[PDB]
C-alpha cells in the first residue's frame, strides 16, 4: 500500500509484509492442528488500477508468498508460491470483470470468519473450486446492483478446467455465484458452485460422483469496536480428505461445516479473538462420519499502529485420539510479529 | 513506474499481470500453443545512474511468474529470470553490458516479434545469439559515436555455458549487428557463430563444431502502419526432437521466414496478420522437415499504455504426417493485460 | 534503498542489485576455490520502519536471491531463496528485539573481515548455527549501552531448533551473545554460541557430541580511508564438511580459523584489497588435522558512486593438490559488474 506511481491516469501500490512466526506444539508437532517450530514468511504483491476515463477502470494484482522457514539448501523454495495473478475492466454500474488466479465465489461468504489472529478460515482451501485462491478463474462483480440498489452486492463466476498431475489440485469447469447485502455495519452473504470434476479425481478411493458442489451462507456484524460472525456451508464430493492409516485421498461424499468468531477491539490496541470450527466429513468410504476439523480458538492482535502489530493465536483441538482419518489431535499456539506495508 | 529520482539515480519498478486462457482441440497435445489458462505475472527493476557528464551506469533484472500452477507442489513450474545484467554507457563510444541479456541475432529478429501472443518463434531462449541467454558480454553503439541518428552496431561476446542438457548449453562465441532505421524504415543484419559443446555433438541430431546464426530484417513503421520481414538460417543451432525416435539434438541447417503486417486504428483496435515459417533441412534420417509453419490472425485492443485485450489465432499448416511429430493443431489465444 | 513511502509514521524502501559476475579457473573448475563459469545474479529486497510512540519503532526487512546464471528451463530456479525475513521493534535506550531469518551473533564478529570484493567471509557458513544466516532466530540487541557510552554495544540471541531433513542444515535450541566497543576508528568484538546438535547431525560419520559451540574475536582498524581487520575463531562440532574421497559429510570436530584483510580507499573510488585466509579442521575422522580454507587474495572495486561498481577478485589458492578431503586446490578469479538501489 505504497503508492509509487500516481500519473498519466496510473496507480500502483508495492505491498508487502515480513511475518516473523513461530508454532509450538507437543513434541515434534506430528499430531496437532498446526504443527510445530518456525513458520516465519513474508509476502509481496502489486496492486494497481488505470482510469482509462471517467467510467472505466482497468486493473491488476499479482501476491507471491515466499517462506522464510527454509534453508539456504535444497529445500529453500519449499512453500514458495503465487497467490493472486489477475487483471481486470471495470465499467461504472456495469459491472466488473476479472480473470486469472483469484478468489473462488465461496469465498465472498467464508471471508467473514476468516478473520483470526493466525489460523480459522479452515474451509477455505486453495485450489478447490470455489472456497479459496483458485486458477483459471473469470469474475463478475456487480455493486449496489447496478446503482440502483444500496447496500445489495452479487457475482457470478465461470471456473475454467485445470487438469493437473494431482487429484487434489484439479477441477472441471463450473459456475459459481454470490448475493450480499450490508447494513448499518451488518452484512449477510450466501453463495453456490458448482463443478465437474476431472478423472483423476473420480479415480481416487475417498469421494464418488461427477459433479463438485459448494455453498455457504455468512452473517456479519462489525461496528462499536465488536466484531460478531458466521459461517454455515456443506460440500458434496469436494473437500479434499486423507485417510492417515490407509495412505489413501480424494474428497469427502459431504461436509458439514460451521465456523462462529467473536473479536472486540480495545482503543490501544489490543484485540482479543475467540471462535468456534467444526468441519465434519460425511459418507467418506469405510468410516462413515468423521471431524475434519474441531476446535475453541482464543487468541489476540496487538496492534500499535497500520503497520506493525503481534499477536498469539491458541487453537484447543477437538479432535480425538482415536479420530477415524487420523486427524491430529493436540493443540498449537501461534506467536508472531508483523511489519506491513 | 519511477520509484527514485534523486542524487543523479532513477530506477523504475516495472511488471505486468497477465489474465489469458488458450484453446486448442481436445488437451492440446497435437496443437501449435497448447490448451488452458496460461494467466502469469512479470517484474522487473531497471536502474541507471549519472556518474559523469560522459558516463552512466546502469541494471535491469525480469522476472516471470507463472499465475496457472496451483498453490501445491507444482507451484514453481516455469517461473524463471529472464534478464539480469549491469553495464556503463559512455557517451559517445558506447555501452558495455555482461549478464542475462538478448543475444545479438535478436537485433534483426525483434522486428517480427509482434504478435499479441505468438509469433517470433526462432528466437528460443538459451540458443546462442538468437533469445535471452545467459553469460554474455554486449558491446553497443547507438547513433554511431553520436554522428548519425538512427545507424546502430553491436559485438556481443558469448561465454561457454556447460550445463546439464546439451538444449541449454553453449560454447564460446562471438555474434554482431548493423542497423539503420530512418523516417520509418528500418533495416538490419546479424551474425553469430559459436563453438558447440561436447554434449551437444553427442546427441543424434545435428553434426558439426560451430552453431551459426544469422538473420537480417526490413521495416516499415509509420502512418499508422507496422510491416516487417525477417529472413534467417541457422547452423547447428536449433533445438529439435524427433517424437517417433524420442531422439533430440539441433538441426543440421534451417531457413526461416516471418512476415507480419499490423495496422493502428486511432481508437485503439490493433489487427495483425502473420506468416512464418521455419524449415529445418539435412535432418537425419529425414532430410527435410517443418518446424513452423502458420498464418495468424489477431487483435490488441488498446485502452491506454496501461491496459489491453488480445485475442491471437494461430492457423497451423503443419500436417498430421509431420517426420518429426510437430503438432498439427490450431491454437487461440485471449487475454487481458494489466502493466505499469 | 529506494524509498517508495514515507508519511504517516511510516518509511519503507525497496533496494536490490544486478551483478555482471564472472569466474575463471583451471578446467570448468571443478577442482577450484570458487568455480568456473557465468555467475550473474540478482537481489531485491524490502526493509521498513514505523514510528509507533516516542519511544518505540517497528520494522521489517526481506531479501531476496535469484541466479542469473541459469537457463530459463528446468534449471530455472537453481540457487534461489530467502536471504532475510524477520520483524522486530526498537525501544529507544532501551534496545531491540526482532525474529525470523537473520544473521547469527557470531557473525557480528566475523562481519569485521567479510568485506572482500566478492570472496572471503568464508567461516561465515549459512544455517550454521550462529556464524551465518540462520533461521528461527530471536535476536535483543543494544547500541551503546542503553544510551549512555557511545560505541559500546551488545547482544543476545535465541536460537529455536530447526530439524530439517539434512543434517547440514539442521540446529536444536542454541543460545549466544556478542559485545563489541569502536571507538574513534578502532573497534573490537567478541562473540560466542553454543547448541544442541539433532540426532540426525549426530548420525553423520563426521563429528562427535552432544553439542555445537562457535565463537570469534575480532579487532579492527577503520579510519583515515585504511581499512584493517583480522578475525580469529574456533569451533566445536559445527562447521560442516565433506570427504570427497571417501564421499562423507558431517562436522568438523574442531576448527581454528584466521582472517586478515587490508584495504585502502582512494577518493577518486578504487579500494585496492589484499587478504588472508586460513581455517584448519582438526581431529576429524580417519584424517586428523586438514585445512579447509588456506588462500591470499588480491583484488580491487572501483566505485564510481553510490549505485555503481566494478571488481576483480583473485584467489590465490595455496590448498595442496593432495589435500585429505579432497579440498579444490585451484585459483579462481572473478570479475564483476554491479548496479544497485
Ligand atoms: C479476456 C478473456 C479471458 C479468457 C476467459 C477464459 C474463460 C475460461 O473459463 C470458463 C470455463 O467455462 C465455464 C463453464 O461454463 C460451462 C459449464 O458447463
Ligand atoms: C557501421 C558498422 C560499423 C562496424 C564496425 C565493425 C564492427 C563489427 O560488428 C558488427 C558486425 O555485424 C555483423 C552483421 O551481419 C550481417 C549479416 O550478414
Ligand atoms: C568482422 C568483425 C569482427 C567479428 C564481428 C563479430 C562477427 C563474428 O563472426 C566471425 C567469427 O568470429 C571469430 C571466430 O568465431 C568462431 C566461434 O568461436
Ligand atoms: C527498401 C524496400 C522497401 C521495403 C519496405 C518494407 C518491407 C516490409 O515487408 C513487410 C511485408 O510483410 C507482409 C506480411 O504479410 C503477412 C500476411 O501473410
Ligand atoms: C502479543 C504477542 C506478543 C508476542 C511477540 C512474539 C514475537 C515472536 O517470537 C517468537 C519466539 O521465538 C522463540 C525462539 O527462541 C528459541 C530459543 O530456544
Ligand atoms: C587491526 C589488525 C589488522 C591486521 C590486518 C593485516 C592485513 C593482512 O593482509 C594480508 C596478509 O598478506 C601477506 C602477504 O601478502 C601478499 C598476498 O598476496
Ligand atoms: C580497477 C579495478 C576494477 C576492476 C574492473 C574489471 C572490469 C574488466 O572486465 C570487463 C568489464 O566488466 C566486468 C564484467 O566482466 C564480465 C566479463 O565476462
Ligand atoms: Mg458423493
Ligand atoms: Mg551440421
Ligand atoms: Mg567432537
Ligand atoms: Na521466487
Ligand atoms: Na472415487
Ligand atoms: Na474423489
Ligand atoms: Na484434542
Ligand atoms: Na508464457
Ligand atoms: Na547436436
Ligand atoms: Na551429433
Ligand atoms: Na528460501
Ligand atoms: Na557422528
Ligand atoms: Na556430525
Ligand atoms: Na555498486
Ligand atoms: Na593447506
Given at each position: 500500500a505504497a503508492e509509487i506511481y500516481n500519473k498519466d491516469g496510473n496507480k500502483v501500490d508495492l505491498y508487502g509484509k515480513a511475518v516473523g512466526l513461530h508454532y509450538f506444539s507437543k513434541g515434534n508437532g506430528e499430531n496437532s492442528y498446526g504443527g510445530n517450530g518456525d513458520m516465519t514468511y513474508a509476502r509481496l504483491g502489486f496492486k494497481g488500477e488505470t482510469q482509462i476515463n471517467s467510467d472505466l477502470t482497468?486493473?491488476?494484482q499479482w501476491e507471491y508468498n515466499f517462506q522464510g522457514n527454509n534453508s539456504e539448501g535444497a529445500d529453500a523454495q519449499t512453500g514458495n508460491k503465487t497467490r493472486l495473478a489477475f487483471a481486470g475492466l471495470k465499467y461504472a454500474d456495469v459491472g466488473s470483470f476479472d480473470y486469472g488466479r483469484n478468489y473462488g465465489v465461496?469465498?465472498?461468504?467464508?471471508?467473514?470468519?476468516?478473520?483470526?489472529?493466525?489460523?480459522?478460515?479452515?474451509?477455505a482451501y486453495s485450489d478447490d473450486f470455489f472456497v479459496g485462491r483458485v486458477g483459471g478463474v473469470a469474475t463478475y462483480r456487480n455493486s449496489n446492483f447496478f446503482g440502483?440498489?444500496?447496500?445489495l452486492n452479487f457475482a457470478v463466476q465461470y471456473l475454467g478446467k485445470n487438469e493437473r498431475d494431482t487429484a487434489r489440485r484439479s477441477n472441471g469447469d463450473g459456475v459459481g455465484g454470490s448475493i450480499s447485502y450490508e447494513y448499518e455495519?451488518?452484512?449477510?452473504?450466501?453463495?453456490?458452485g458448482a463443478a465437474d470434476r476431472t478423472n483423476l479425481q473420480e479415480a481416487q478411493p475417498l469421494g464418488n460422483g461427477k459433479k463438485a458442489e459448494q455453498w455457504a451462507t455468512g452473517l456479519k456484524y462489525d461496528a462499536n469496536n465488536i466484531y460478531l460472525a458466521a459461517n454455515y456451508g456443506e460440500t458434496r464430493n469436494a473437500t479434499p480428505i486423507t485417510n492417515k492409516f490407509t495412505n489413501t485421498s480424494g474428497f469427502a461424499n459431504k461436509t458439514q461445516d460451521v465456523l462462529l468468531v467473536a473479536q472486540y477491539q480495545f482503543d490501544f490496541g489490543l484485540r482479543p479473538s475467540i471462535a468456534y470450527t467444526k468441519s465434519k466429513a460425511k459418507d467418506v468410504e469405510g468410516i462413515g462420519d468423521v471431524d475434519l476439523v474441531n476446535y475453541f480458538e482464543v487468541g489476540a492482535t496487538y496492534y500499535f499502529n497500520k503497520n506493525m502489530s503481534t499477536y498469539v493465536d491458541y487453537i484447543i483441538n477437538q479432535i480425538d485420539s482415536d479420530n477415524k482419518l487420523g486427524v491430529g489431535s493436540d493443540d498449537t499456539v501461534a506467536v508472531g510479529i508483523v511489519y506491513q506495508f
Open positions: 482497468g486493473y491488476g465461496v469465498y465472498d461468504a467464508l471471508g467473514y470468519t476468516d478473520m483470526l489472529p493466525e489460523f480459522g478460515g479452515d474451509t440502483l440498489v444500496d447496500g455495519g451488518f452484512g449477510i452473504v450466501g453463495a453456490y
